[PDB]
Write an enzyme that holds these catalytic residues in place. Structure first.
Site: not given
Ligand SMILES: Cc1cc2nc3c(=O)[nH]c(=O)nc-3n(C[C@H](O)[C@H](O)[C@H](O)COP(=O)(O)O)c2cc1C
Ligand SMILES: CC(=O)O[C@@H](C)/C(C)=C/CC/C(C)=C/Cc1c(O)c(Cl)c(C)c(C=O)c1O
Ligand SMILES: O=C(O)c1cc(=O)[nH]c(=O)[nH]1
Length: 366
Positions: A118-119, A68, A115-116, A187-188, A326, A184-185, A151, A254-255
Protein backbone atom coordinates in the site's frame (compact mmCIF):
# COMPACT_ATOMS: atom_id res chain seq x y z
CA UNK A 1 26.82 -23.72 -13.86
CA UNK A 2 28.27 -21.56 -10.99
CA UNK A 3 28.74 -22.83 -7.42
CA UNK A 4 27.16 -19.88 -5.64
CA UNK A 5 24.02 -19.84 -7.91
CA UNK A 6 23.29 -23.38 -6.72
CA UNK A 7 24.23 -22.56 -3.10
CA UNK A 8 21.98 -19.50 -2.87
CA UNK A 9 19.04 -21.09 -4.73
CA UNK A 10 19.06 -24.60 -3.17
CA UNK A 11 20.34 -23.84 0.34
CA UNK A 12 20.92 -20.29 1.65
CA UNK A 13 17.77 -18.49 0.46
CA UNK A 14 15.26 -21.24 1.28
CA UNK A 15 16.89 -21.73 4.73
CA UNK A 16 16.73 -17.98 5.49
CA UNK A 17 13.12 -17.76 4.20
CA UNK A 18 12.25 -20.58 6.62
CA UNK A 19 13.66 -18.44 9.47
CA UNK A 20 12.34 -14.98 8.57
CA UNK A 21 8.87 -13.56 7.97
CA UNK A 22 8.49 -12.02 4.45
CA UNK A 23 8.71 -8.34 5.46
CA UNK A 24 11.58 -9.02 7.89
CA UNK A 25 13.34 -10.78 5.02
CA UNK A 26 12.70 -7.80 2.69
CA UNK A 27 14.07 -5.38 5.29
CA UNK A 28 17.20 -7.53 5.84
CA UNK A 29 17.76 -7.79 2.08
CA UNK A 30 17.66 -3.99 1.74
CA UNK A 31 20.04 -3.64 4.71
CA UNK A 32 22.55 -6.22 3.39
CA UNK A 33 22.42 -4.73 -0.08
CA UNK A 34 22.89 -1.15 1.17
CA UNK A 35 26.00 -2.27 3.13
CA UNK A 36 27.43 -4.11 0.09
CA UNK A 37 27.41 -7.51 1.85
CA UNK A 38 26.91 -9.40 -1.38
CA UNK A 39 28.56 -12.28 -3.30
CA UNK A 40 31.25 -11.45 -5.88
CA UNK A 41 29.44 -10.52 -9.12
CA UNK A 42 31.99 -12.11 -11.46
CA UNK A 43 30.03 -11.69 -14.74
CA UNK A 44 31.72 -9.13 -17.02
CA UNK A 45 29.09 -7.44 -19.22
CA UNK A 46 29.79 -8.05 -22.91
CA UNK A 47 29.17 -5.48 -25.65
CA UNK A 48 26.25 -7.56 -26.97
CA UNK A 49 24.23 -6.73 -23.81
CA UNK A 50 24.53 -2.95 -24.25
CA UNK A 51 21.27 -1.12 -25.15
CA UNK A 52 20.79 2.54 -26.12
CA UNK A 53 17.27 3.75 -25.26
CA UNK A 54 15.45 6.58 -23.34
CA UNK A 55 18.38 8.97 -24.09
CA UNK A 56 20.82 6.68 -22.26
CA UNK A 57 23.33 3.82 -22.56
CA UNK A 58 22.48 0.73 -20.49
CA UNK A 59 25.49 -1.57 -19.91
CA UNK A 60 23.12 -4.55 -19.68
CA UNK A 61 19.34 -4.74 -20.07
CA UNK A 62 18.54 -6.34 -16.65
CA UNK A 63 17.17 -3.95 -14.02
CA UNK A 64 15.79 -4.19 -10.52
CA UNK A 65 12.04 -3.44 -10.56
CA UNK A 66 10.33 -0.91 -8.27
CA UNK A 67 9.31 -2.11 -4.84
CA UNK A 68 12.57 -3.60 -3.64
CA UNK A 69 14.30 -0.31 -2.81
CA UNK A 70 11.21 1.80 -2.15
CA UNK A 71 13.08 4.62 -0.43
CA UNK A 72 16.41 4.78 -2.35
CA UNK A 73 18.53 3.17 0.37
CA UNK A 74 20.37 0.47 -1.60
CA UNK A 75 21.07 1.95 -5.06
CA UNK A 76 24.84 1.44 -5.06
CA UNK A 77 24.53 -2.11 -3.64
CA UNK A 78 22.11 -2.93 -6.45
CA UNK A 79 24.64 -1.86 -9.12
CA UNK A 80 27.21 -4.01 -7.26
CA UNK A 81 24.81 -6.97 -7.76
CA UNK A 82 25.19 -6.46 -11.51
CA UNK A 83 21.92 -4.74 -12.43
CA UNK A 84 22.26 -2.60 -15.61
CA UNK A 85 19.86 -0.04 -14.13
CA UNK A 86 18.08 0.58 -10.84
CA UNK A 87 14.51 1.77 -10.26
CA UNK A 88 13.59 3.06 -6.81
CA UNK A 89 10.12 3.67 -5.40
CA UNK A 90 7.26 3.96 -5.48
CA UNK A 91 7.71 7.26 -3.62
CA UNK A 92 4.67 9.22 -2.38
CA UNK A 93 4.67 13.01 -1.77
CA UNK A 94 4.18 12.81 1.99
CA UNK A 95 5.49 9.96 4.16
CA UNK A 96 2.92 7.23 4.76
CA UNK A 97 2.81 3.93 6.59
CA UNK A 98 1.08 1.71 4.03
CA UNK A 99 -1.17 -1.21 5.08
CA UNK A 100 -1.05 -3.08 8.43
CA UNK A 101 1.35 -6.05 8.78
CA UNK A 102 1.37 -8.75 7.55
CA UNK A 103 1.16 -7.41 4.00
CA UNK A 104 3.57 -9.62 2.00
CA UNK A 105 3.23 -13.36 1.48
CA UNK A 106 5.34 -16.05 -0.12
CA UNK A 107 3.86 -18.74 -2.40
CA UNK A 108 6.92 -21.03 -2.55
CA UNK A 109 5.12 -23.80 -4.50
CA UNK A 110 4.33 -21.24 -7.23
CA UNK A 111 7.62 -19.31 -7.14
CA UNK A 112 5.35 -16.30 -6.52
CA UNK A 113 4.72 -13.49 -4.01
CA UNK A 114 1.53 -11.61 -3.13
CA UNK A 115 1.95 -8.13 -1.67
CA UNK A 116 -0.36 -5.42 -0.39
CA UNK A 117 2.23 -2.96 0.94
CA UNK A 118 0.00 0.00 0.00
CA UNK A 119 2.80 2.46 -0.93
CA UNK A 120 4.70 2.50 2.37
CA UNK A 121 7.00 5.45 1.66
CA UNK A 122 9.51 7.70 3.42
CA UNK A 123 8.11 10.48 1.18
CA UNK A 124 9.62 12.82 -1.39
CA UNK A 125 11.72 14.98 0.96
CA UNK A 126 13.54 12.06 2.61
CA UNK A 127 14.21 10.36 -0.74
CA UNK A 128 15.30 13.69 -2.31
CA UNK A 129 17.94 14.16 0.36
CA UNK A 130 19.09 10.54 0.07
CA UNK A 131 19.54 10.90 -3.70
CA UNK A 132 21.17 14.34 -3.38
CA UNK A 133 23.86 12.80 -1.14
CA UNK A 134 25.05 10.67 -4.12
CA UNK A 135 23.88 12.83 -7.06
CA UNK A 136 27.32 13.25 -8.64
CA UNK A 137 28.23 9.60 -8.04
CA UNK A 138 24.99 8.79 -9.94
CA UNK A 139 25.91 11.19 -12.76
CA UNK A 140 29.14 9.22 -13.26
CA UNK A 141 27.31 5.87 -13.05
CA UNK A 142 24.77 7.05 -15.65
CA UNK A 143 27.61 8.25 -17.92
CA UNK A 144 29.12 4.75 -17.47
CA UNK A 145 25.94 3.01 -18.65
CA UNK A 146 24.19 2.55 -15.29
CA UNK A 147 21.02 4.72 -15.23
CA UNK A 148 18.63 5.43 -12.36
CA UNK A 149 14.83 5.37 -12.52
CA UNK A 150 12.46 6.86 -9.96
CA UNK A 151 8.95 5.51 -9.62
CA UNK A 152 6.28 7.95 -8.39
CA UNK A 153 3.13 7.11 -6.43
CA UNK A 154 0.34 9.04 -4.79
CA UNK A 155 -0.72 9.37 -1.16
CA UNK A 156 -3.74 7.44 0.16
CA UNK A 157 -5.55 10.58 1.37
CA UNK A 158 -4.69 13.01 -1.46
CA UNK A 159 -7.62 14.80 -3.11
CA UNK A 160 -5.74 15.52 -6.36
CA UNK A 161 -3.82 12.57 -7.92
CA UNK A 162 -2.34 14.62 -10.75
CA UNK A 163 -0.88 17.12 -8.27
CA UNK A 164 0.77 14.25 -6.33
CA UNK A 165 2.53 13.09 -9.51
CA UNK A 166 3.39 16.67 -10.48
CA UNK A 167 5.07 17.14 -7.05
CA UNK A 168 7.08 13.96 -7.66
CA UNK A 169 8.26 15.20 -11.05
CA UNK A 170 9.35 18.53 -9.55
CA UNK A 171 11.12 17.03 -6.52
CA UNK A 172 12.70 13.82 -7.90
CA UNK A 173 12.67 14.47 -11.66
CA UNK A 174 15.94 16.43 -11.39
CA UNK A 175 17.63 13.41 -9.77
CA UNK A 176 16.32 10.73 -12.21
CA UNK A 177 17.28 9.42 -15.63
CA UNK A 178 13.67 8.36 -16.01
CA UNK A 179 10.48 8.80 -14.03
CA UNK A 180 7.67 6.27 -13.80
CA UNK A 181 4.05 7.34 -13.44
CA UNK A 182 2.78 4.37 -11.54
CA UNK A 183 -0.93 4.18 -12.22
CA UNK A 184 -1.05 0.38 -11.77
CA UNK A 185 -0.64 -0.52 -8.09
CA UNK A 186 -3.45 -2.91 -7.13
CA UNK A 187 -3.12 -1.69 -3.49
CA UNK A 188 -4.33 1.93 -3.59
CA UNK A 189 -8.11 2.49 -3.93
CA UNK A 190 -9.02 4.17 -7.24
CA UNK A 191 -5.42 4.24 -8.55
CA UNK A 192 -5.86 1.91 -11.55
CA UNK A 193 -8.78 4.09 -12.77
CA UNK A 194 -6.08 6.66 -13.69
CA UNK A 195 -5.28 4.25 -16.57
CA UNK A 196 -8.60 5.22 -18.26
CA UNK A 197 -8.33 7.43 -21.40
CA UNK A 198 -9.68 10.82 -20.20
CA UNK A 199 -8.06 10.60 -16.73
CA UNK A 200 -4.74 9.42 -18.19
CA UNK A 201 -4.59 12.15 -20.87
CA UNK A 202 -5.27 14.87 -18.27
CA UNK A 203 -2.78 13.35 -15.79
CA UNK A 204 0.00 12.77 -18.31
CA UNK A 205 -0.41 16.23 -19.90
CA UNK A 206 0.25 17.76 -16.44
CA UNK A 207 3.18 15.38 -15.74
CA UNK A 208 4.81 16.13 -19.10
CA UNK A 209 4.34 19.89 -18.67
CA UNK A 210 6.12 19.70 -15.28
CA UNK A 211 8.93 17.56 -16.72
CA UNK A 212 9.41 19.94 -19.65
CA UNK A 213 9.79 22.82 -17.14
CA UNK A 214 12.95 21.27 -15.66
CA UNK A 215 16.42 22.40 -16.76
CA UNK A 216 17.84 20.34 -19.68
CA UNK A 217 20.47 18.46 -17.61
CA UNK A 218 17.74 17.56 -15.09
CA UNK A 219 15.02 16.58 -17.55
CA UNK A 220 14.15 12.85 -17.24
CA UNK A 221 12.33 10.52 -19.62
CA UNK A 222 8.73 9.84 -18.50
CA UNK A 223 7.29 6.30 -18.61
CA UNK A 224 3.88 4.97 -17.59
CA UNK A 225 3.71 1.67 -15.71
CA UNK A 226 0.64 -0.37 -16.53
CA UNK A 227 -1.28 -3.30 -15.09
CA UNK A 228 -1.42 -6.83 -16.56
CA UNK A 229 -5.22 -6.80 -15.97
CA UNK A 230 -6.30 -4.27 -18.57
CA UNK A 231 -9.08 -4.82 -21.06
CA UNK A 232 -8.32 -4.64 -24.79
CA UNK A 233 -10.12 -1.24 -24.73
CA UNK A 234 -7.87 0.02 -21.92
CA UNK A 235 -4.72 -1.00 -23.81
CA UNK A 236 -5.89 0.63 -27.07
CA UNK A 237 -6.64 3.84 -25.10
CA UNK A 238 -3.25 3.85 -23.36
CA UNK A 239 -1.44 3.34 -26.69
CA UNK A 240 -3.43 6.21 -28.25
CA UNK A 241 -2.63 8.61 -25.35
CA UNK A 242 1.06 7.60 -25.29
CA UNK A 243 1.37 8.44 -28.99
CA UNK A 244 -0.70 11.65 -28.78
CA UNK A 245 1.39 13.05 -25.89
CA UNK A 246 4.84 11.70 -26.79
CA UNK A 247 5.26 9.66 -23.57
CA UNK A 248 8.81 8.29 -23.65
CA UNK A 249 8.08 4.68 -22.75
CA UNK A 250 6.04 2.04 -20.98
CA UNK A 251 6.76 -0.34 -18.12
CA UNK A 252 4.82 -3.54 -18.69
CA UNK A 253 3.68 -4.84 -16.19
CA UNK A 254 2.89 -4.35 -12.52
CA UNK A 255 1.53 -7.22 -10.39
CA UNK A 256 -1.76 -8.98 -11.19
CA UNK A 257 -5.00 -9.01 -9.18
CA UNK A 258 -5.90 -12.16 -11.09
CA UNK A 259 -5.33 -15.58 -9.52
CA UNK A 260 -4.47 -17.90 -12.41
CA UNK A 261 -5.86 -21.39 -12.20
CA UNK A 262 -3.28 -23.77 -10.76
CA UNK A 263 -1.79 -21.71 -7.89
CA UNK A 264 -0.77 -24.09 -5.09
CA UNK A 265 0.44 -21.76 -2.34
CA UNK A 266 -1.63 -21.86 0.86
CA UNK A 267 -1.74 -18.04 0.71
CA UNK A 268 -3.08 -17.78 -2.88
CA UNK A 269 -6.30 -16.08 -1.80
CA UNK A 270 -4.62 -13.25 0.13
CA UNK A 271 -5.57 -9.77 -1.20
CA UNK A 272 -2.85 -8.04 -3.22
CA UNK A 273 -0.73 -8.10 -6.36
CA UNK A 274 0.68 -11.42 -7.51
CA UNK A 275 4.24 -11.48 -8.91
CA UNK A 276 6.74 -14.13 -10.08
CA UNK A 277 6.28 -17.17 -12.30
CA UNK A 278 2.43 -17.12 -12.55
CA UNK A 279 2.59 -13.55 -13.88
CA UNK A 280 5.34 -14.22 -16.46
CA UNK A 281 3.38 -15.00 -19.60
CA UNK A 282 0.54 -12.62 -18.87
CA UNK A 283 3.22 -9.87 -18.74
CA UNK A 284 4.95 -11.11 -21.93
CA UNK A 285 1.63 -11.06 -23.79
CA UNK A 286 0.93 -7.51 -22.54
CA UNK A 287 4.38 -6.41 -23.84
CA UNK A 288 3.56 -8.03 -27.15
CA UNK A 289 0.22 -6.20 -27.41
CA UNK A 290 1.61 -2.79 -26.39
CA UNK A 291 4.54 -3.08 -28.83
CA UNK A 292 2.12 -3.74 -31.71
CA UNK A 293 -0.30 -0.97 -30.65
CA UNK A 294 2.58 1.54 -30.55
CA UNK A 295 4.12 0.29 -33.84
CA UNK A 296 7.38 -0.57 -32.08
CA UNK A 297 8.11 3.16 -31.71
CA UNK A 298 7.72 3.37 -27.91
CA UNK A 299 10.41 1.78 -25.69
CA UNK A 300 9.06 -0.88 -23.32
CA UNK A 301 10.64 -2.06 -20.08
CA UNK A 302 9.33 -5.62 -19.67
CA UNK A 303 8.75 -6.97 -16.18
CA UNK A 304 6.90 -9.88 -14.56
CA UNK A 305 8.22 -13.35 -13.78
CA UNK A 306 11.74 -12.98 -15.25
CA UNK A 307 14.04 -15.56 -13.64
CA UNK A 308 16.21 -16.80 -16.54
CA UNK A 309 17.84 -15.74 -19.77
CA UNK A 310 14.96 -17.40 -21.65
CA UNK A 311 12.39 -15.35 -19.70
CA UNK A 312 14.34 -12.17 -20.49
CA UNK A 313 14.75 -13.00 -24.20
CA UNK A 314 11.05 -13.85 -24.55
CA UNK A 315 10.15 -10.37 -23.33
CA UNK A 316 12.81 -8.76 -25.54
CA UNK A 317 11.56 -10.67 -28.63
CA UNK A 318 7.99 -9.63 -27.69
CA UNK A 319 9.07 -5.98 -27.78
CA UNK A 320 10.92 -5.06 -24.57
CA UNK A 321 14.08 -2.95 -24.93
CA UNK A 322 14.96 -3.62 -21.30
CA UNK A 323 13.73 -6.02 -18.61
CA UNK A 324 13.39 -5.93 -14.83
CA UNK A 325 13.06 -8.56 -12.14
CA UNK A 326 12.20 -8.59 -8.48
CA UNK A 327 10.46 -11.77 -7.28
CA UNK A 328 13.22 -14.04 -8.70
CA UNK A 329 15.78 -12.18 -6.53
CA UNK A 330 13.68 -12.97 -3.46
CA UNK A 331 13.80 -16.73 -4.18
CA UNK A 332 17.23 -17.25 -5.73
CA UNK A 333 19.27 -14.43 -4.25
CA UNK A 334 21.88 -12.11 -5.83
CA UNK A 335 23.45 -14.78 -8.14
CA UNK A 336 20.23 -14.75 -10.21
CA UNK A 337 21.34 -11.46 -11.86
CA UNK A 338 24.55 -12.95 -13.31
CA UNK A 339 22.59 -16.09 -14.23
CA UNK A 340 20.03 -14.16 -16.29
CA UNK A 341 22.74 -12.15 -18.05
CA UNK A 342 24.92 -15.19 -18.86
CA UNK A 343 21.94 -17.18 -20.14
CA UNK A 344 20.67 -14.22 -22.16
CA UNK A 345 24.04 -13.73 -23.88
CA UNK A 346 24.22 -17.48 -24.71
CA UNK A 347 20.69 -17.50 -26.17
CA UNK A 348 21.30 -14.38 -28.27
CA UNK A 349 24.30 -16.15 -29.85
CA UNK A 350 22.31 -19.37 -30.35
CA UNK A 351 19.47 -17.52 -32.11
CA UNK A 352 21.85 -15.55 -34.37
CA UNK A 353 21.36 -12.10 -32.85
CA UNK A 354 24.35 -9.74 -32.94
CA UNK A 355 23.14 -8.30 -29.63
CA UNK A 356 20.12 -7.37 -27.51
CA UNK A 357 19.20 -4.50 -29.84
CA UNK A 358 18.78 -6.87 -32.80
CA UNK A 359 16.37 -9.05 -30.80
CA UNK A 360 13.98 -6.26 -29.69
CA UNK A 361 10.57 -7.03 -31.19
CA UNK A 362 12.00 -9.93 -33.30
CA UNK A 363 8.82 -12.01 -32.90
CA UNK A 364 6.80 -9.32 -34.69
CA UNK A 365 9.06 -9.65 -37.76
CA UNK A 366 8.84 -13.50 -38.06
C1 LIG B 1 6.88 -6.81 -2.50
C2 LIG B 1 6.64 -6.01 -3.77
C3 LIG B 1 6.56 -4.62 -3.71
C4 LIG B 1 6.35 -3.91 -4.90
N1 LIG B 1 6.26 -2.55 -4.88
C5 LIG B 1 6.11 -1.83 -6.03
C6 LIG B 1 6.05 -0.36 -6.06
O1 LIG B 1 6.19 0.28 -4.98
N2 LIG B 1 5.88 0.26 -7.23
C7 LIG B 1 5.77 -0.41 -8.42
O2 LIG B 1 5.63 0.21 -9.48
N3 LIG B 1 5.82 -1.76 -8.48
C8 LIG B 1 5.99 -2.49 -7.36
N4 LIG B 1 6.06 -3.88 -7.40
C9 LIG B 1 5.92 -4.56 -8.68
C10 LIG B 1 7.26 -4.88 -9.34
O3 LIG B 1 7.92 -3.66 -9.69
C11 LIG B 1 7.04 -5.69 -10.61
O4 LIG B 1 6.27 -4.89 -11.53
C12 LIG B 1 6.27 -7.00 -10.36
O5 LIG B 1 6.58 -7.59 -9.09
C13 LIG B 1 6.54 -8.02 -11.49
O6 LIG B 1 7.92 -8.41 -11.52
P1 LIG B 1 8.47 -9.73 -10.79
O7 LIG B 1 7.55 -10.86 -11.20
O8 LIG B 1 9.87 -9.87 -11.34
O9 LIG B 1 8.47 -9.45 -9.30
C14 LIG B 1 6.26 -4.61 -6.21
C15 LIG B 1 6.36 -6.00 -6.24
C16 LIG B 1 6.55 -6.70 -5.08
C17 LIG B 1 6.66 -8.20 -5.16
C1 LIG C 1 18.85 -11.11 -2.93
C2 LIG C 1 18.07 -10.66 -1.75
O1 LIG C 1 16.85 -10.48 -1.87
O2 LIG C 1 18.71 -10.32 -0.59
C3 LIG C 1 19.99 -10.86 -0.22
C4 LIG C 1 20.85 -9.62 0.02
C5 LIG C 1 19.89 -11.74 1.04
C6 LIG C 1 21.06 -12.72 1.31
C7 LIG C 1 18.76 -11.65 1.88
C8 LIG C 1 18.43 -12.35 3.05
C9 LIG C 1 16.96 -12.23 3.49
C10 LIG C 1 16.03 -13.00 2.52
C11 LIG C 1 15.96 -14.54 2.60
C12 LIG C 1 15.26 -12.28 1.61
C13 LIG C 1 14.40 -12.82 0.63
C14 LIG C 1 13.09 -12.03 0.45
C15 LIG C 1 11.83 -12.57 0.76
O3 LIG C 1 11.73 -13.84 1.24
C16 LIG C 1 10.65 -11.83 0.57
CL1 LIG C 1 9.13 -12.55 0.94
C17 LIG C 1 10.69 -10.53 0.09
C18 LIG C 1 9.37 -9.75 -0.09
C19 LIG C 1 11.93 -9.97 -0.21
C20 LIG C 1 12.04 -8.55 -0.78
O4 LIG C 1 13.14 -8.14 -1.15
C21 LIG C 1 13.11 -10.72 -0.04
O5 LIG C 1 14.32 -10.19 -0.35
O1 LIG D 1 3.10 -0.65 -2.51
C1 LIG D 1 2.48 -1.59 -3.04
O2 LIG D 1 1.56 -2.24 -2.46
C2 LIG D 1 2.65 -1.95 -4.48
C3 LIG D 1 2.73 -0.97 -5.45
C4 LIG D 1 2.79 -1.41 -6.79
O3 LIG D 1 2.85 -0.59 -7.72
N1 LIG D 1 2.72 -2.72 -7.06
C5 LIG D 1 2.62 -3.64 -6.08
O4 LIG D 1 2.57 -4.85 -6.36
N2 LIG D 1 2.59 -3.26 -4.78
Amino acid sequence: ATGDERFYAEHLMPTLQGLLDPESAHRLAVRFTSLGLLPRARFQDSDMLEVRVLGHKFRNPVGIAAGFDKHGEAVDGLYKMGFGFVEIGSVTPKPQEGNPRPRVFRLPEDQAVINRYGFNSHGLSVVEHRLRARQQKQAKLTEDGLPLGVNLGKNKTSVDAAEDYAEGVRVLGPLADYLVVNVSSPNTAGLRSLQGKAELRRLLTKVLQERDGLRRVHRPAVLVKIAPDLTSQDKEDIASVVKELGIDGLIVTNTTVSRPAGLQGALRSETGGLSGKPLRDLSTQTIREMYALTQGRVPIIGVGGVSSGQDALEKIRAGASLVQLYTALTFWGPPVVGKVKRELEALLKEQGFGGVTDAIGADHRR
